[PDB]
Amino acid sequence: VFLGFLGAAGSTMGAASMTLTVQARNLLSGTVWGIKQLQARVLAVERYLRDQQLLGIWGCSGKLICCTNVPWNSSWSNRNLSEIWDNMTWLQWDKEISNYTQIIYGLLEESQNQQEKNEQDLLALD
Amino acid sequence: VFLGFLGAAGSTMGAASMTLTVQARNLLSGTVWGIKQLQARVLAVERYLRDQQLLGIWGCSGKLICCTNVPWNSSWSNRNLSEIWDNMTWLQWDKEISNYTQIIYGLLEESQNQQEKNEQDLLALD
Amino acid sequence: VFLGFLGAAGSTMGAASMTLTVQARNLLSGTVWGIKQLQARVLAVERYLRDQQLLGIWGCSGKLICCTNVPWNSSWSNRNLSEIWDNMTWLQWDKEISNYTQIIYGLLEESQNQQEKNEQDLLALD
Amino acid sequence: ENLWVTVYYGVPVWKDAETTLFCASDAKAYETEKHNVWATCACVPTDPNPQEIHLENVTEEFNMWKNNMVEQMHTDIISLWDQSLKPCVKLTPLCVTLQCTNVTNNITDDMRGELKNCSFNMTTELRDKKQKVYSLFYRLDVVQINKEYRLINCNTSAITQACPKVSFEPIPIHYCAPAGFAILKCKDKKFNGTGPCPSVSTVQCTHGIKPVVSTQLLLNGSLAEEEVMIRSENITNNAKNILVQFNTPVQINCTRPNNNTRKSIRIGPGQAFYATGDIIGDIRQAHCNVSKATWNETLGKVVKQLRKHFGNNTIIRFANSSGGDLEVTTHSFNCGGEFFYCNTSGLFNSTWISNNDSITLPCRIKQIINMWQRIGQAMYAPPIQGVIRCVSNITGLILTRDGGANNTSTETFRPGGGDMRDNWRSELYKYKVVKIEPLGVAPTRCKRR
Ligand SMILES: *[C@@H]1O[C@H](CO)[C@@H](O[C@@H]2O[C@H](CO)[C@@H](O[C@@H]3O[C@H](CO[C@H]4O[C@H](CO)[C@@H](O)[C@H](O)[C@@H]4O)[C@@H](O)[C@H](O[C@H]4O[C@H](CO)[C@@H](O)[C@H](O)[C@@H]4O[C@H]4O[C@H](CO)[C@@H](O)[C@H](O)[C@@H]4O)[C@@H]3O)[C@H](O)[C@H]2NC(C)=O)[C@H](O)[C@H]1NC(C)=O
Ligand SMILES: *[C@@H]1O[C@H](CO)[C@@H](O[C@@H]2O[C@H](CO)[C@@H](O[C@@H]3O[C@H](CO[C@H]4O[C@H](CO)[C@@H](O)[C@H](O)[C@@H]4O)[C@@H](O)[C@H](O[C@H]4O[C@H](CO)[C@@H](O)[C@H](O)[C@@H]4O)[C@@H]3O)[C@H](O)[C@H]2NC(C)=O)[C@H](O)[C@H]1NC(C)=O
Ligand SMILES: *[C@@H]1O[C@H](CO)[C@@H](O[C@@H]2O[C@H](CO)[C@@H](O[C@@H]3O[C@H](CO[C@H]4O[C@H](CO)[C@@H](O)[C@H](O)[C@@H]4O)[C@@H](O)[C@H](O[C@H]4O[C@H](CO)[C@@H](O)[C@H](O)[C@@H]4O)[C@@H]3O)[C@H](O)[C@H]2NC(C)=O)[C@H](O)[C@H]1NC(C)=O
Ligand SMILES: *[C@@H]1O[C@H](CO)[C@@H](O[C@@H]2O[C@H](CO)[C@@H](O)[C@H](O)[C@H]2NC(C)=O)[C@H](O)[C@H]1NC(C)=O
Ligand SMILES: *[C@@H]1O[C@H](CO)[C@@H](O)[C@H](O)[C@H]1NC(C)=O
Ligand SMILES: *[C@@H]1O[C@H](CO)[C@@H](O)[C@H](O)[C@H]1NC(C)=O
Ligand SMILES: *[C@@H]1O[C@H](CO)[C@@H](O)[C@H](O)[C@H]1NC(C)=O
Ligand SMILES: *[C@@H]1O[C@H](CO)[C@@H](O)[C@H](O)[C@H]1NC(C)=O
Ligand SMILES: *[C@@H]1O[C@H](CO)[C@@H](O)[C@H](O)[C@H]1NC(C)=O
Ligand SMILES: *[C@@H]1O[C@H](CO)[C@@H](O)[C@H](O)[C@H]1NC(C)=O
Ligand SMILES: *[C@@H]1O[C@H](CO)[C@@H](O)[C@H](O)[C@H]1NC(C)=O
Ligand SMILES: *[C@@H]1O[C@H](CO)[C@@H](O)[C@H](O)[C@H]1NC(C)=O
Ligand SMILES: *[C@@H]1O[C@H](CO)[C@@H](O)[C@H](O)[C@H]1NC(C)=O
Ligand SMILES: *[C@@H]1O[C@H](CO)[C@@H](O)[C@H](O)[C@H]1NC(C)=O
Ligand SMILES: *[C@@H]1O[C@H](CO)[C@@H](O)[C@H](O)[C@H]1NC(C)=O
Ligand SMILES: *[C@@H]1O[C@H](CO)[C@@H](O)[C@H](O)[C@H]1NC(C)=O
Ligand SMILES: *[C@@H]1O[C@H](CO)[C@@H](O)[C@H](O)[C@H]1NC(C)=O
Ligand SMILES: *[C@@H]1O[C@H](CO)[C@@H](O)[C@H](O)[C@H]1NC(C)=O
Ligand SMILES: *[C@@H]1O[C@H](CO)[C@@H](O)[C@H](O)[C@H]1NC(C)=O
Ligand SMILES: *[C@@H]1O[C@H](CO)[C@@H](O)[C@H](O)[C@H]1NC(C)=O
């Protein structure tokens, strides 16, 4: 089944995790009044490289999905495994986690690939 | 400790190697007089993709740090391991190596991933 | 030997495969009449990200060279291994394959990394 | 044994295309300043050490007659002329009745005046009292009306005076291609400019091409190699111009023996018109010298190349223009700011069968011009003080052949021009724009598990 772009918006997060390769595909898409689209598609590629930079400096690089060594803080809406992927949409989840997105981002770019890669540099010399 | 953007500029290279994820984060940052900033953030993203292209064609791709199979030529300011990371700043080091940066770049983009990946092409078929 | 940008244009594909890191380097390069170059370097970076997007959605990502799991259809100019890399230039080859480039592209973006990565998602959960 | 596709990034693969070219004009030309002469204002400085990579084994087909760089350069120079004339003083209140008379001289009746001493009204700085001032205009600039005259461009378009700060001096301009494109250059000594080229090289920026706007005689151009070159899109077609390129330059000297004065009459507030005052010295006409010996050897070397295409044993006769506008029947060019129109009847008056001084040519001077066949913008060239002397190189011709021959073995050639694109085709014949497609797939015995 292929619901299309933004297809599984009202479905659970577990169900919407199957449509990751659909919203990612149509995210980049390949005299005045003609500069209207130029400045827009320039901000479009700046927004794309912005997200790609965040996805790269973290422990992912490989897009779509990646795991991390970060303990899930109970204060970030303490929910259960079966209460998130089978009872909540991505919009409803982002509405709750909007307070802690920047904190987690800081715990992802700094605490991980800056201490993990240096650890590998210490593990790869021997 | 987080000295901030350009924090460890006067610190040793070994100490400044801990602040790699700080200068990399703030490197991209997300009628006339309005095109003044447009042409600037366009050169900003061209400078970013330029460095990312050099970082990609080499044996790195994964940013921050990466190792290479290139012997350190003594003519490139023959210093010791403890005389570089514990007695020299990055500005002072780049001032000396400015003559050989382009040579090393040539020995990194050509000699490595062009002969190494083809070697893997011969090693991955069996 | 370094023939330079577009150096091995008249050489065989096997010989021209050694100069991949040269044409890739000079591909990005870092009031009216000043917007003349602006709109051009914007189309330049759009052409670059277009090729990088095609190179990413396929089974490559790592630039220069990458292998794929696609059987070569004999109808696509049935030539031999030694008759391509040691008897044909890249311009002469692209002149013949121009009909089937879009077909192969379709067999590369859809049939591979859409079925291969989902297979890995099934292989990585156990 | 079964092959597998492999993506290669960075392959020497290009295809013919058209893109947006930018400029380049050294670093010493920017030191010429003088309030931005011609174009060089925000132009990128030319690379001190240009690189030209000779593509060995490469044979590429060029086409000077289907080349887009010519059209781009033409539109670029046109837009340049407009941007150079937008902030200049507009001579809107200059179409007043001109009470003209003969210049102060002493006969004969065959001198036909040429110079007219016009008296007229003018608006001063204030919007009340007028101004009874006089100037000196050429006959090609005025026209009587029923002695009272008027400017020849009244019931055509507007007129703007060229600012005295800028100059019309052709400076070398290197055309360069952005990233992803390249310019191919033919480096063979006998490239008659169409078809496959044996020795092809790649460049980022072309050599210094001076935009010399001229007709009939190609001035300040690139010399040909070995034998003089003859280029035509269709030799059997007598409607297509024949661009001739010389090997040895023909020394030409043009002078203006009328060292003039600039009257700065004030059409305030702010604006100021530069009229022509009295002439200091003798009333002489502008003229151009061509060395008789050089012209003989050049013509005798060209006719020997002309016999290679119209039969070995034929008669080649030279005649001047058939008629039309002044820009086509005369050698139109710019020198020192003035616009000369020289009589080329002493150069194309010959008859060549199968087997010590200077030739002076009468040159007229026009100040109100409408080059590139443009209607809407008439430019008034301000007078230039001092005797103007200029030495140039005749490096090529633009010839046309007469039609409906059938009978007879002789061929007659006359000077032509009009289309200024031909002036650019004489330098862009050895260059062409290509786009790089570095993505190339190819089979080999490689896969993963
Ligand atoms: C093909 O290419 C050739 C080669 O360049 C070119 O010949 C050039 O011809 C032009 C005339 O059209 C020349 O440019 C002028 O030259 C005169 C005379 O030069 C003397 O002065 C210098 C001073 O050091 C001497 O070194 C030199 O040897 C000569 O003795 C200059 O007087 C001109 O200067 C004025 O005119 C310029 C344009 O109008 C101004 O931009 C410049 O600032 C000067 O203006 C000021 O001085 C004026 C002097 O009276 C004054 O009245 C003005 O109001 C203003 O204040 C000018 O430079 C040039 O010399 C020739 N080239 C060479 C190598 O000699 C052809 O023209 C070209 N063909 C075509 C069709 O373009
Ligand atoms: C273009 O045409 C215009 C006219 O439209 C010309 O400009 C005029 O030129 C004439 C010259 O032919 C000028 O006439 C001269 O005026 C001088 C001004 O003197 C003033 O002051 C004296 C007192 O000192 C008064 O007596 C006099 O009336 C003036 O008010 C006179 O001094 C000149 O006289 C001298 O020359 C004549 C020549 O025959 C002698 O007979 C005299 O004895 C004396 O030596 C002379 O009369 C006129 O003033 C100009 N007008 C303007 C508005 O500038 C150009 O000359 C003409 N150019 C060309 C190339 O044809
Ligand atoms: C082309 O036509 C122009 C028309 O403008 C002529 O230019 C004039 O030429 C004359 C003659 O050379 C110049 O007159 C000269 O004036 C000098 C003094 O000028 C300065 O001082 C006065 C005040 O006294 C100021 O107003 C002025 O602005 C200057 O600051 C004299 O010293 C000259 O005499 C010396 O030179 C001559 C040769 O030129 C010698 O015979 C003398 O014995 C003496 O040594 C002279 O009288 C006049 O200044 C010029 N005007 C302008 C605007 O440039 C050109 O001469 C003419 N050229 C040709 C080839 O025909
Ligand atoms: C253009 O003018 C130059 C300069 O006067 C002429 O060159 C001179 O030629 C004579 C005769 O050969 C020599 O004696 C001089 O030494 C030359 N002078 C210079 C500065 O070169 C040239 O012949 C003229 N050409 C034409 C066609 O009139
Ligand atoms: C977890 O949340 C609590 C309370 O909101 C906070 O004290 C703690 O700092 C959080 N953990 C991290 C790693 O930020
Ligand atoms: C389930 O939710 C409760 C209540 O917030 C919490 O105590 C518990 O830690 C959660 N368990 C899991 C597995 O998320
Ligand atoms: C967001 O943070 C604010 C400030 O502490 C708080 O009032 C609000 O309840 C928080 N919302 C969520 C969904 O955590
Ligand atoms: C190292 O530098 C020395 C001296 O400059 C030179 O002899 C040698 O060829 C260089 N080797 C490399 C690999 O750069
Ligand atoms: C120090 O540098 C010298 C000279 O190149 C060399 O002989 C020595 O091995 C180096 N020692 C260390 C510890 O790097
Ligand atoms: C840079 O190279 C130049 C030229 O050989 C030389 O004079 C200078 O000493 C070099 N500087 C360094 C820091 O190597
Ligand atoms: C291979 O090419 C042949 C002939 O054009 C065609 O019949 C067949 O469908 C093609 N197969 C594939 C997989 O492209
Ligand atoms: C060589 O070409 C023949 C004839 O088309 C074909 O049978 C064979 O598979 C080809 N072999 C290779 C290695 O390409
Ligand atoms: C391209 O396809 C067309 C139409 O099928 C055909 O006429 C032509 O021969 C083909 N050329 C190549 C090089 O495959
Ligand atoms: C000059 O004067 C003569 C004599 O009156 C006259 O015939 C002629 O029209 C005037 N103008 C010219 C340009 O000769
Ligand atoms: C303008 O021309 C008229 C012609 O009718 C004349 O009477 C007058 O003197 C001229 N000049 C001035 C300043 O009015
Ligand atoms: C022109 O040169 C040709 C060829 O050498 C010749 O026959 C002729 O007499 C020359 N003309 C003059 C006027 O010298
Ligand atoms: C050509 O020269 C003749 C002299 O015989 C002259 O009468 C005629 O006007 C000239 N034609 C052109 C177009 O120059
Ligand atoms: C050009 O010169 C010839 C010969 O003197 C002459 O017959 C002709 O009328 C002139 N052309 C013009 C337009 O003056
Ligand atoms: C052309 O040359 C011939 C031969 O010298 C001469 O008789 C004729 O008058 C010339 N034509 C012109 C317009 O000078
Ligand atoms: C023009 O020709 C003369 C005469 O040989 C030469 O000195 C000069 O350099 C030439 N100008 C060029 C080629 O731009």
Judge whether B124 is closer than 8 Å to chain D, CB to CB. Answer: yes
Q: Is D261 in the pocket of ligand 18 (CB under 6 A)?
A: no
Judge whether B17 is closer than 8 Å to chain A, CB to CB. Answer: yes
Q: CA torsion angle for C39, C44, C48, C54 (degrees, to 10)? A: 70
Strand order in the sheet with D439-444: C67-71, D4-9, D439-444
What is the 3-class SS of chain D, one letter each residue? CCCEEEEEECCCCEEECCCCCECCCCCCHHHHCCCCCCCCCCCCCCCCCCCEEECCCCCEEECHHHCHHHHHHHHHHHHHHHHHHCCCCECHHHCCCEECCECCCCCCCCCCCCEEEEEECCCCCCCCCCCCEEEEEECCCEEECCCEEEECCCCCCEEEECCCCCCCCCCCECCECCCCEEEEEECCCCCCCCEEECCEEEECECCCECCCCCCCEEECCCCCCCCCEEECCCCCCCCCCEEEEEEEEEEEEEEECCCECEEEECCCCCCCEEEECCCCCCCCCCEEEEEHHHHHHHHHHHHHHHCCCCCCCCEEEECCCCCCCHHHHCEEEEECCEEEEECCCCCCCEEECCCCCEEEEEEEEECEECHHHCCCEEEECCCCECCEEEEEEEEEEEEEECCCCCCCCEEEEEECCCCCHHHHHCCCCCEEEEEECCEEEEEECCCCC
Q: Which residues between 159 and 198 in chain D have a beta carbon less than 8 angstroms from any beta carbon of chain C?
A: 178-180, 182
User: 3-state DSSP call for residue C70?
Assistant: strand
Of C21, C38, C41, the CB nearest to B110: C21
Q: Which residues contact B109 (CB under 8 A, 6 or more apart)?
A: B54, B57, B58, C21, C25
β-bridge pairing D4-9 and C67-71: antiparallel
Q: Is B120 in the pocket of ligand 10 (CB under 6 A)?
A: no
Cα separation, D344 vs D217, in Å, equals 9
Q: Which residue of C has its CA nearest to B38?
A: C38
Contact A101, A21 (CB under 8 A): no
**Would you give the end-to-end CA distance of chain D in angstroms?**
16
Cα separation, D100 vs D103, in Å, equals 9
User: 3-state DSSP call for residue C97?
Assistant: helix
Q: Which of D13, D314, D374 is nearest to D158 (CA)?
A: D374
- Residue D67: left (phi > 0), alpha (psi -120 to 50), or beta? beta
Cα separation, D309 vs D230, in Å, equals 10
Question: Are B42 and A42 a contacting pair at CB < 8 A?
Answer: yes
Roughly what angle, to the nearest 10 degrees, separates helices A35-57 and A101-109? 60
Roughly what angle, to the nearest 10 degrees, separates helices B35-57 and C35-57? 40
Matching residue, tokens 């199957």: A18
Distances (CA, A) of D17 to D20, D67, D182: 10, 10, 10
Q: For chain B, what is the largest distance between any 2 Cα atoms, rounded to a whole number of angstroms?
A: 62
Q: Which of D254, D272, D265, D255 is nearest to D136 (CA)?
A: D265
Cα separation, A93 vs D182, in Å, equals 51
Q: What are phi and psi of D206, to 5 degrees?
A: -70, 170
**Cα D125 from chain centroid (whole Å):** 39
Judge whether A63 is closer than 8 Å to chain B, CB to CB. Answer: no
Cα separation, B11 vs B85, in Å, equals 10
Q: Which of D180, D58, B57, D11 is nearest to C13 (CA)?
A: D11
Q: Which of D437, D24, D9 is nearest to D209 (CA)?
A: D24
Q: Let me know how long chain B is.
A: 126
Contact D82, D374 (CB under 8 A): no
Question: Are B57 and C22 a contacting pair at CB < 8 A?
Answer: no
Matching residue, tokens 């050489």: C11
Give contacts of B62 with chain A, Cβ < 8 Å: 61, 117
Q: Please, after which residues is chain B broken with C–N above 2.5 Å?
A: 30
Q: Which two tokens stand for residue B62?
A: 């994964």
The answer to whether the Cα torsion of D63, D68, D69, D73 is positive or negative is: positive
The partner residues of D333 in beta bridges, in order of sequence, read D340
What DSSP state is assigned to residue C67?
A: E
Cα separation, B123 vs D90, in Å, equals 76
Q: What are phi and psi of D255, to 5 degrees?
A: -135, 155
Q: What are phi and psi of C25, to 5 degrees?
A: -70, -50
Spell out the long-range contacts of C41-47 with Cβ–Cβ below 8 A and sequence spacing 24 or more. C41/B42, C41/B46, C41/D178, C41/D179, C42/A38, C42/A42, C42/B42, C44/D178, C44/D179, C44/D180, C45/A45, C45/B45, C45/B46, C45/B49, C46/A41, C46/A45, C47/D180
- Residue D153: left (phi > 0), alpha (psi -120 to 50), or beta? alpha
Element containing residue C84 per DSSP (H, E): helix C81-84
Cα separation, C34 vs D196, in Å, equals 36
Question: Are C63 and D9 a contacting pair at CB < 8 A?
Answer: yes
CA atoms within 13 A on the CB side of D243: 25
Mutate to test the pocket of ligand 17, among D321, D332, D345 (most ligand atoms within 8 A of CB): D345
Cα separation, D244 vs D272, in Å, equals 44
What DSSP state is assigned to residue A99?
A: T
**Cα D395 from chain centroid (whole Å):** 12
What DSSP state is assigned to residue C68?
A: E
Minimal CA separation from C8 to chain A, in Å: 30
Question: Are B121 and D6 a contacting pair at CB < 8 A?
Answer: yes
User: 3-state DSSP call for residue B107?
Assistant: helix
* Other Cβ atoms closer than 10 A to D378: 20
Distances (CA, A) of A54 to A57, A97, C51: 6, 18, 22
Q: Let me know how long chain A is.
A: 126
Indicate which atom in ligand 4 lies nearest the CA of residue D250.
Answer: 27
Cα separation, D385 vs D261, in Å, equals 5
Residue ranges with strand state E in C27-78: 67-71
Roughly what angle, to the nearest 10 degrees, separates helices C35-57 and C101-109? 60
Q: Which of C93, C109, C101 is nearest to C61 (CA)?
A: C109
Cα separation, D181 vs D305, in Å, equals 36
Residue B35 CB-density burial (10 A; 0-12 exposed, 13-18 middle, 19+ buried): middle
Q: What are phi and psi of D25, to 5 degrees?
A: -150, 60
The partner residues of D22 in beta bridges, in order of sequence, read D176
Distances (CA, A) of C67 to C78, D6, D438, D441: 20, 5, 17, 10
Cα separation, C124 vs D215, in Å, equals 76
**Would you give the end-to-end CA distance of chain C in angstroms?**
50
Q: Which two tokens stand for residue D183?
A: 């310019």
Closest Cα to atom 3 of ligand 13 = C99
Q: Which of D17, D14, D68, D23 is nearest to D41 (CA)?
A: D23
Buried b (16+ CB within 10 A) or exposed e, D351-364: ebeeeeebbebebb
Q: What are phi and psi of D183, to 5 degrees?
A: -110, 120
**Cα A14 from chain centroid (whole Å):** 15
Cα separation, D279 vs D283, in Å, equals 7
Query: Which structural technique was applied?
Result: X-ray
**Would you give the end-to-end CA distance of chain B in angstroms?**
49
Q: Let me know how long chain D is.
A: 449
Question: Are B124 and D445 a contacting pair at CB < 8 A?
Answer: no
Spell out the long-range contacts of A19-23 with Cβ–Cβ below 8 A and sequence spacing 24 or more. A20/A64, A20/A65, A21/A64, A21/C114, A21/C117
Mutate to test the pocket of ligand 1, among D250, D276, D385, D390 (most ligand atoms within 8 A of CB): D390
Q: Which residues between 43 and 62 in chain B have a beta carbon less than 8 angstroms from any beta carbon of chain A?
A: 45, 48-49, 62
Indicate which atom in ligand 17 lies nearest the CA of residue D319.
Answer: 1
Q: Which residues contact D125 (CB under 8 A, 6 or more apart)?
A: D266, D268, D269
